[PDB]
Amino acid sequence: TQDTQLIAVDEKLDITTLTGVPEEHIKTRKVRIFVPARNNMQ
Amino acid sequence: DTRPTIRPRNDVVHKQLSAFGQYVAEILPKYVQQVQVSCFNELEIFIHPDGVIPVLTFLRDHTNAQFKSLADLTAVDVPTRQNRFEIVYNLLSLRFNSQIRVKTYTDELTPIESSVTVYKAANWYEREIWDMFGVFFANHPDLRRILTGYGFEGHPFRKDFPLSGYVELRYDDEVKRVVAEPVELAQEFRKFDLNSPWEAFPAYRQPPE
Amino acid sequence: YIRPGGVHQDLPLGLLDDIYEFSKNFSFRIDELEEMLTNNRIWRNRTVDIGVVTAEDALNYGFSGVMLRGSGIQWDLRKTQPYDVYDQVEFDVPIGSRGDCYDRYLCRVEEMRQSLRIISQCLNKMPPGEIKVDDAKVSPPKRAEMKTSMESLIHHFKLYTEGYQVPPGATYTAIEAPKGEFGVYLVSDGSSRPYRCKIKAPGFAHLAGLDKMSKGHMLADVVAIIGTQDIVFGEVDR
Amino acid sequence: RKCDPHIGLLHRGTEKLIEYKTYLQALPYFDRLDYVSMMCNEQAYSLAVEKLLNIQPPPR
Amino acid sequence: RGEYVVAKLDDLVNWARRSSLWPMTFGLACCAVEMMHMAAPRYDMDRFGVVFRASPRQSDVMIVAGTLTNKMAPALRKVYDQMPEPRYVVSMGSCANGGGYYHYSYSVVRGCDRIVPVDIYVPGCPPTAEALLYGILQLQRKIKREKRLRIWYRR
Amino acid sequence: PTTKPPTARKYIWTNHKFNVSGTPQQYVPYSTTRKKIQEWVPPSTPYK
Amino acid sequence: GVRTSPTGEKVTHTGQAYDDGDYRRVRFSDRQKEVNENFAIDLIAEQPVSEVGSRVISCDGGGGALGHPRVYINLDKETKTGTCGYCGLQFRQPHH
Amino acid sequence: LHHALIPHGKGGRSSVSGIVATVFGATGFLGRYVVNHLGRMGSQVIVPYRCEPYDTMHLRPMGDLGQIIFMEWNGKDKDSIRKVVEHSNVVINLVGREWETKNFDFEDVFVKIPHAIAQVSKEAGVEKLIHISHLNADIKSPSRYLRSKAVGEKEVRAAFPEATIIKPSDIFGREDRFLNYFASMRWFGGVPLISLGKETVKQPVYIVDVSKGIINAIKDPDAKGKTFAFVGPNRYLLFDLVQYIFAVAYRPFLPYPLPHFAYRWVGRLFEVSPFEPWTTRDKVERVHMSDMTLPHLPGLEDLGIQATPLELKAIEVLRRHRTYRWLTSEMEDVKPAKTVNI
Amino acid sequence: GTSVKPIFSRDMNEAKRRVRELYRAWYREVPNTVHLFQLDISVKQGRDKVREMFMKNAHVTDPRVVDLLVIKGKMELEETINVWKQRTHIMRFFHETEAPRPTDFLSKFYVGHDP
Amino acid sequence: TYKFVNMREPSMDMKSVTDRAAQTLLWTELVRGLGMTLSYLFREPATINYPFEKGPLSPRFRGEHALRRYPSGEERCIACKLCEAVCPAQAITIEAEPRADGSRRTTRYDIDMTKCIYCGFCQEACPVDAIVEGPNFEFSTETHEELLYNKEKLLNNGDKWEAEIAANIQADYLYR
Amino acid sequence: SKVKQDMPPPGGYGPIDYKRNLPRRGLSGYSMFAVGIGTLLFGYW
Amino acid sequence: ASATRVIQLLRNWASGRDLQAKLQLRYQEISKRTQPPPKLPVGPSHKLSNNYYCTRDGRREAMPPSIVMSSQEKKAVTPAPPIKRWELSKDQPYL
Ligand SMILES: COC1=C(OC)C(=O)C(C/C=C(/C)CC/C=C(/C)CC/C=C(\C)CC/C=C(\C)CC/C=C(/C)CC/C=C(\C)CC/C=C(/C)CC/C=C(\C)CC/C=C(\C)CCC=C(C)C)=C(C)C1=O
Ligand SMILES: NC(=O)C1=CN([C@@H]2O[C@H](COP(=O)(O)OP(=O)(O)OC[C@H]3O[C@@H](n4cnc5c(N)ncnc54)[C@H](OP(=O)(O)O)[C@@H]3O)[C@@H](O)[C@H]2O)C=CC1
Ligand code: SF4
Ligand code: SF4
Ligand code: SF4
Ligand SMILES: [Zn+2]
């Protein structure tokens, strides 16, 4: 679509090499993906 | 006008800019993907990333556009969108006293051609965007950090970056020099969940996905 | 003090009269400055034909304010795109010809006197009325209705805890700040807090042009070029 | 011959912190931004918020 | 008694210091501009003995006035190390007293004291040109109350 | 104040104080709250 | 009011007092533990109760706009004098 | 453990390590670094002082708010010590000077007050008193300092049986008065060494290791009662050590012999100064005292701290003494000096 | 899809190439900074620190990513040879004041509740 | 409209040329400056001597905070946390509790005078006029800890400057 | 009652000067040279 | 602290103007620091009837950005008519 030497990269994206997150905070930390619960008092 | 609070509406400007929206769209259908005018009379020119150089030259050089002033060059990092970063240009036309906004999208890896040639003002704005966000700009005269401290790692304005950061500083006497330590707040940032659980604007209601 | 939807509260009684007393005296000091430097030969040589920037490059460099009006470009946001009630106020915009360091010094000093005319009109045409938008969902209600009315207290509570939720959208509003074209790019998701706030600092674009100006000039000139540029590093470092 | 203007010796993360504050709480940021043109600074921010809110200030 | 002559030489030395301390030309941010108003004819800092000498080799009190950030913190401590002895550092304004408005950001050191031994703390955002005018004079009282030779004669 | 005396109330101080920094009357910050988590006091009776 | 701790400290209105060991106590030595004597708890008890005769009574707190939001205390329960939740002033019916 | 002393937070400036230290005489070489490590982990340090508070200002910017609170104490008044060590759990003693002021004899600052802290701390309720005394401490040593330290150790141990006694050898560092002593010797003509200083073997130890030694000793639950001897890795004959110092400083070396009685006379002349003496008769004796080897005494590696050879961190002390000529010269320019090893 | 726009490098190999002249430049750069910056470490003590970053950055495989940090390394090298950094900035690579952090589970368990 | 500022071509008449020649040769604009400063030497200095006389302020001045209390003596703060919720610097930190009397007061009201920037929002926030900055611009301390105010210090400031806050608020309670 | 604000007085306000009021003073250029030569001639004489 | 007339002429002559007409130091001409209590006005919407918010709000009357073309003869049109060159000043032409 660009004719800009489109290399077919396949390896899954990993920018942890650049974001600068320190070693402790990148592997050990576990994130949770969830929809927030409706505040029951509302 | 009976209403004393509502901001007045300028339909003449609204029609005027919308016609120019069809203009720019027809001249460059190769890069322009979407064109819209907001309720407060601002025109957004949604272009494709490779159109950063061609489209900008058109609005800067075409007789009927004559946008010869780079107002600003920003990006709004949206973690949601597939290509998170969204590079935004604002141009002011001295001859036609109008303002235009060309917006393009970009992920972390794909580079955007530097607009230094078409707008020499972009050069320093170019450096800031990479420094704060990490959007690398291709074929730039000198891409370098402009705001963060020397040797500072990470891109601060990126949403995933914490508010306080990772690295603190203090003077340590056994080394007689300022040294960096892991961040350790005497008070954590009290985050506030100050969002109403009730819809605010029926006009801007998203479709029921 | 200047808040969205109007100012916080009305001026104290006798404030405008105090403005009138000062404005009377000021023009008798602005010329006093001009007596000290404007015709001084040492100040002239230190500032004439030095740090000269042309028209197109200044326009291309993203310059604004004095950088444009100093080099001949007759541009001023207060006139071209008047915000607030700047249209109902008559004033002149000094435009230079040489574009150098000196021409801007007169441009700034002449901007002093032109501002005095604006102040004279503002004092003489002050209208009666409130100081904030009547909309209590945007501007907090006065303390009087706070303590007697349900709706005012509810609005004051939410306004100072949650704040007004602005509609989603993005805009870039620029004004003729004394340095130059100060502008903000506010992107709002629709919640009670902004999503992105880019701050167009007039000195940011200016300072990038330091090298283009100081070409062949000595270091003492660079000191002079810094001064005329009127940069304060709170705005540029954001 | 060449002047490299290294800036950043005053980079308070203003545009980062504004993300975490309500619109009213973000006002003093602009006050501190260009600390010699204070009212002009708030005037810029106020006009933008009024534009997005579609609300005009009273004549006074 | 040797205590009497020590005290008399004590009073002579400090009185010279408190009536001739020279605040450096060290301004940072919003907190610096109004400090000029202290040096402006309204309050006239110079009348109290001080002169605003640059060149930390020839200055006594360092007016850290403004936001202290990461990129400059090495520059300040180099500057402070260059100042001869005695040297005092008045942390001026809330930004230099712990971080001020931007206490929680990413490139500001939360407090000028984490780099320098910080003397009397003058608060304000900004402190009025008079507010730290007392701050300077209150330091002059601190200089008055020192012992130095009194400790030396009793060391 | 002689012409217009300020309205007097019970809790208003009767002796103004200068800033007491430096002198041993200076103010030291301290937490004004009670303890959140106490501990299960071990019993006095022996093991058996 | 302000009592004295067994160590010698002064208990505040909240009842905070550093205990015997409490290494934090070092700060108060060579200094003082700032305590406000005008305890709010017992500075409102001695105020008399108004004997106003009605069923619903407003309380501006004095000074109108200088006071607190006007609340209507219901003086109907003939066991306990109604008190404004903002200032603590006790109101009661005049026992019929 | 008291609820306010439970360790909390990752070790840092705002962390609650759980140590309430009472470092005595912290306004000095040794005291400067020990509080820095104590401040780094986060620990209320009482840091009593006697000098002008200005000289304690550099002690301030090494801890969180309200962690380095200062107190005024006098060496001959028990009440001052009791106030300083009242609410604490660890007391570090670093008092002691290398000269003889009219108001403080050598035996005073090494027996009298060190007895006073030792006795009062036990009554108050301290549990980890750590008293510091020279490694070479001998009862019948030629120098009163070395005698006073030896009797000092005896008395504190009696009053406080579970008081860890640290026995450092000569300590080198930026403001050490040991490397600087020989570096400053260049001013008075050549470098005078008795019998060329060829019969005196010294084993110096870097300051930071002993500082970490004290910190680890506090954390270690086995330091109770023990007597550690903090010594460096290598022993150097004094002449070769001075050869190393002047090579690192690149100043010319001009050794010349000097009989012991005449050096003692020179030390007497320098003692006359009513200000900080440069060299006392006692100091001359110390330079002659070779560090006695005490292998039975538990050393430094048992704690966990690995000694840093003086060759590595020597330019720190002596870069200042170099003229502008060899100011940027690195470590590898000067070879390591020969080490008479055990 | 899989087709992505590459920054400078066209596969791993010249991406592997670019990390070399960064190491070529860094290695030549170590001894003069130790002299110019008046560092406390030895000339030998700088090469390892230059080295150890490189295979610390070894799990990276994407050619675009590899070229992205070779620019960051070049910029870091750029901001070093003009003495733009200072002694503190360079020394921040040597984690000196920060005390060693444990690694074994038992030591993690003793200090505090953290993984 | 616009006004040109500096292109004034000088005349070339012999009178004008000699005037400029006299100006350059016999320095005149330099003397014009000297006469200016000398005139501005015999004026009255704008200085004021310190504390013996102090600069002028306005009743709505913003300074050291204070926690006032009702005329009865009961504290105004009912701990609604509005001031904490509006604090731009997040300096306000308060926790409440049902007091022994049953009233709703705060256990802790630490205001960190080293964080907040004297916006004055807090005095606008609480609907009972509880927190308010006093006119006392002067509270400089020698140690960092002294600036970190707790509830007790705030009440003490309220009890000390109560005469000023009652008078100043009385003047400006109508403008707001 | 009556709305009272800080409105300007009924007669607006007095005229405010803004134009430059740089005075012109001094002898004519010919006169300056004339008197300057005159002192020289007297000094020589 | 009024200057003696002898030097009143000196300062006036040395600067070629009348200083005493308007001085930088303020005097009794300043407004009194104590003023009568003001009565502030009410806003236009302080009407106890016919003030429904549905006919008064400003936030709920903003539409989403109008879309004019999406990627999913005509005369050339400028964004706005070209500016009209500013006229020269009347109160003060060329300085
Ligand atoms: C960036 O940020 C900044 C600030 O803030 C952070 C500021 O605020 C300000 C604003 C403040 C200002 C004051 C504005 C001006 C300041 C500037 C930095 C601008 C640049 C300045 C200049 C171009 C001008 C500089 C002028 C100076 C330094 C004045 C010099 C002359 C003087 C008379 C003053 C100094 C006088 C002195 C030191 C006293 C005399 C000296 C002595 C040594 C004492 C006498 C000693 C003896 C007699 C010896 C002993 C012998 C004895 C007693 C004899 C008997 C015994 C025997 C044994 C013989 C600015 C501008 C700023 O940019
Ligand atoms: N190489 C070495 O230096 C070695 C030293 N030691 C011992 O370690 C201790 C500390 O050494 P170092 O830090 O180099 O010494 P310094 O002289 O540098 O510091 C001594 C400290 O003790 C204080 N002090 C001394 N005498 C008195 C007194 N009479 N009253 C009150 N305070 C006093 C000093 O206060 P101030 O500064 O105000 O006088 C200062 O805080 C000494 O006992 C020393 O003998 C042991 C082994 C080796
Ligand atoms: S303390 Fe306030 S006035 Fe001073 S620099 Fe910081 S933000 Fe600006
Ligand atoms: S004055 Fe403003 S910033 Fe300071 S504590 Fe109050 S609300 Fe927060
Ligand atoms: S001080 Fe005011 S805003 Fe804060 S809790 Fe009390 S009443 Fe609410
Ligand atoms: Zn009530």
Residue of C nearest to E33 (CA): C232
CB atoms within 10 A of CB F47: 4
Question: Cα–Cα distance between H227 and B28 in angstroms, integer?
Answer: 85
Q: Which helix (H) or strand (E) holds J106?
A: strand J104-112
Interface check I60 vs B, CB under 8 A? no
Query: C102 and J6: CB-CB below 8 Å?
Result: yes
CB atoms within 10 A of CB H299: 16
J154 lines ligand 5 (CB under 6 A): no
Question: Cα–Cα distance between E31 and E29 in angstroms, integer?
Answer: 5
* CA nearest to H36, candidates H3, H58, H14: H58
What secondary structure, in 3-state letters, does chain H show?
Answer: CCCCCCCECCCCCCCECCCCECCECCCCHHHHHHHHHHHHHCCCECCEECCCHHHHHHHCCCCCCCCCCCEECCCCCHHHHHHHCCCCCECEECCCCCCCECCECHHHHHHHHHHHHHHHHHHHCCCCCEEECCCCCCCCCCCHHHHHHHHHHHHHHHHCCCCEEEEECCEECCCCCCHHHHHHCCCCCCEECHHHHCCCEECCEEHHHHHHHHHHHHHCCCCCCCEEEECCCCCEEHHHHHHHHHHHHCCCCCEECCCHHHHHHHHHHHHCCCCCCCCCHHHHHHHHCCCCCCCCCCCCCCCCCCCCCCCHHHHHHHCCCCCCCCCCCCCCCCCCCCCCCC
Does the bond joining F6 to the residue before it have cis omega, within 30 degrees of 0?
A: no
Tokens, residue E16: 């010279």
Residue G61, C-beta contacts closer than 8 angstroms, at least 6 positions apart:
G67, G68, G84, G86, G87, G89, J70, J128
Question: Cα–Cα distance between E18 and J120 in angstroms, integer?
Answer: 36
Question: Cα–Cα distance between J70 and J135 in angstroms, integer?
Answer: 19
Q: How far is the CA of J132 from the centre of ligand 4 (A)?
A: 10
* CB contact at 8 A, F28 and G34: yes
Give CA separation, G75 vs C147, G68, G88, G95, in Å: 21, 19, 14, 10
Question: Cα–Cα distance between H149 and H169 in angstroms, integer?
Answer: 13
Give the DSSP letter of residue I38. Answer: T
Tokens, residue B120: 């020499």
Give CA separation, D37 vs C231, D57, G46, in Å: 11, 21, 54
Q: Is the backbone of residue B79 left (phi > 0), alpha (psi -120 to 50) or beta?
A: alpha
Pairing mode, if any, of strands C169-176 and C181-188?
antiparallel
J87 lines ligand 5 (CB under 6 A): no
Q: How far is the CA of H281 from the centre of ligand 5 (A)?
A: 70
Contacts of J145 in chain H (CB under 8 A): 65-66
Residue H26, C-beta contacts closer than 8 angstroms, at least 6 positions apart:
H32, H34, H35, H45, H47, H48, H49, H59, H94
H96 phi and psi angles, rounded to 5 deg: 130, 135
* CA nearest to J119, candidates J130, J106, J109, J131: J131
Identity at K21, one-letter amino acid code: N
D12 lines ligand 3 (CB under 6 A): no
- Residue entry with tokens 């600074």: D41
What secondary structure, in 3-state letters, does J20-86 show?
Answer: HHHHHHCCCHHHHHHHHHHHCCCCCCCCCCCCCCCCCCCCCCCCCEEECECCCCCECCCCCCHHHHH
Domain boundaries, chain I: 1-115
Q: Is the backbone of residue G62 left (phi > 0), alpha (psi -120 to 50) or beta?
A: left
| Residue H168 bridge partners (DSSP) | H230
CB atoms within 10 A of CB J174: 18
Tokens, residue K32: 């300056």
Q: Which atom of ligand 3 is nearest to the CA of J117?
A: 2
Pairing mode, if any, of strands J2-4 and B112-113?
unpaired
Residue H307, min C-alpha distance to chain F (Å) = 41
Tokens, residue H79: 């009440």
Contacting subunits of E (3+ beta carbon pairs below 8 A): B, C, D, F, H, I, J
CA angle H109, H112, H117 (to 5 degrees): 90
Q: Is the backbone of residue C128 left (phi > 0), alpha (psi -120 to 50) or beta?
A: beta
Tokens, residue I43: 């000339």
Question: Cα–Cα distance between E74 and I90 in angstroms, integer?
Answer: 12
* CA nearest to J74, candidates G41, G58, G68: G41
Question: Cα–Cα distance between E49 and E43 in angstroms, integer?
Answer: 13
**E95 assigned binding-site residue:** yes
Largest CA distance in chain F: 81
Q: Would you call J141 helix, strand, or coil by DSSP?
A: strand
Give CA separation, H331 vs B58, H183, H243, I38, I44, in Å: 61, 17, 15, 11, 11
Identity at A25, one-letter amino acid code: H
Q: Which helix (H) or strand (E) holds J124?
A: helix J121-125
Give the DSSP letter of residue L17. Answer: S
* CA nearest to C12, candidates B106, A19, J173: J173
Give CA separation, B23 vs B177, C117, G71, in Å: 61, 42, 63
Q: What's the helix, strand, coil split of chain B in %, to 5?
A: 20, 25, 55
The count of CB pairs under 8 A between chains G and J is 67
Pairing mode, if any, of strands I3-4 and A7-8?
antiparallel
Question: Cα–Cα distance between J65 and J118 in angstroms, integer?
Answer: 9
User: Within chain B, how many helices (H) and strands (E) appear?
Assistant: 3, 9
Torsion on CA atoms K3, K6, K8, K13, rounded to nearest 10 = 170
Residues 6-65 of G with CB under 8 A from C: 60, 64-65
- Residue entry with tokens 């009482």: H46
Q: Which atom of ligand 5 is nearest to the CA of J76?
A: 7
Give CA separation, E24 vs E51, E60, E72, E77, E113, in Å: 8, 7, 17, 14, 18
Query: K14 and C117: CB-CB below 8 Å?
Result: no
Q: How far is the CA of J106 from the centre of ligand 6 (A)?
A: 17
Nearest-CA residue for atom 4 of ligand 3: E31
CA atoms lying within 13 Å on the CB side of residue H129? 26
Q: What is the CA radius of gyration of chain F?
A: 24
* CB contact at 8 A, E37 and E64: no
Long-range interactions of B164-167: CB distance < 8 A, separation 24+: B164/B189, B164/E104, B164/E105, B164/E106, B165/E105, B165/E106, B165/E107, B166/A20, B166/A21, B166/A22, B166/A25
Question: Cα–Cα distance between H203 and H170 in angstroms, integer?
Answer: 7
Q: Would you call L68 helix, strand, or coil by DSSP?
A: strand
Q: What is the CA radius of gyration of chain I?
A: 18
Resolution (A): 3.5
* CB contact at 8 A, E99 and B187: no
Question: Cα–Cα distance between B109 and I69 in angstroms, integer?
Answer: 11
Identity at C129, one-letter amino acid code: G
Interface check C75 vs B, CB under 8 A? yes
CA angle H26, H29, H30 (to 5 degrees): 65
CA atoms lying within 13 Å on the CB side of residue C169? 31
Question: Cα–Cα distance between J134 and D40 in angstroms, integer?
Answer: 28
Positions at the binding site of G for Zn(2+): 59, 68, 84, 87
Give CA separation, C169 vs B42, B66, H231, in Å: 11, 26, 70
- Residue entry with tokens 């007597």: H227
Question: Cα–Cα distance between B127 and B105 in angstroms, integer?
Answer: 18
* CA nearest to B170, candidates B183, B155, B153, B152: B183
Torsion on CA atoms G41, G45, G47, G53, rounded to nearest 10 = 120
* CB contact at 8 A, J72 and J44: no
* Residues of L engaging B, defined by a Cβ cutoff of 8 Å: 44-45, 55-71, 74, 76-83
* CA nearest to D5, candidates B122, I80, B115, C236: C236
Give the DSSP letter of residue J96. Answer: E
* CA nearest to H247, candidates H189, H331, H316, H139: H331
Experimental method of this PDB entry? cryo-EM
Residue L72, C-beta contacts closer than 8 angstroms, at least 6 positions apart:
none
Which burial class, exposed, middle or buried, applies to E4 when counting CB atoms under 10 A from its CB (0-12, 13-18, 19+)? exposed
Residue of B nearest to I6 (CA): B110
Torsion on CA atoms J8, J13, J16, J17, rounded to nearest 10 = 100
| Residue C93 bridge partners (DSSP) | J2
Q: Would you call I21 helix, strand, or coil by DSSP?
A: helix
Nearest-CA residue for atom 2 of ligand 4: J119
Q: Would you call F29 helix, strand, or coil by DSSP?
A: coil
Residue H223, C-beta contacts closer than 8 angstroms, at least 6 positions apart:
H128, H130, H164, H217
Long-range interactions of J75-78: CB distance < 8 A, separation 24+: J75/G40, J75/J105, J75/J130, J75/J155, J76/G68, J76/J126, J76/J128, J76/J129, J76/J130, J77/J105, J77/J106, J77/J109, J77/J126, J77/J128, J77/J130, J77/J131, J78/G85, J78/G86, J78/J103, J78/J104, J78/J105, J78/J128, J78/J130
Tokens, residue H117: 């802290």
* CB contact at 8 A, H283 and H266: no
Contacting subunits of B (3+ beta carbon pairs below 8 A): A, C, D, E, H, I, J, L
Q: How far is the CA of D31 from the centre of ligand 5 (A)?
A: 25
Question: Cα–Cα distance between H91 and H116 in angstroms, integer?
Answer: 12
Residue H200, C-beta contacts closer than 8 angstroms, at least 6 positions apart:
H237, H238, H287, H288, H289, H290
* CB contact at 8 A, I15 and I69: no
**Residues, chain F:** 48
CA atoms lying within 13 Å on the CB side of residue C8? 16
Question: Angle at which helices B11-27 and B52-61 pack, to 10 degrees?
Answer: 120
Nearest-CA residue for atom 8 of ligand 3: E30
| Residue H156 bridge partners (DSSP) | none
CB atoms within 10 A of CB L71: 12
- Residue entry with tokens 């007169």: C106
CB atoms within 10 A of CB H6: 9
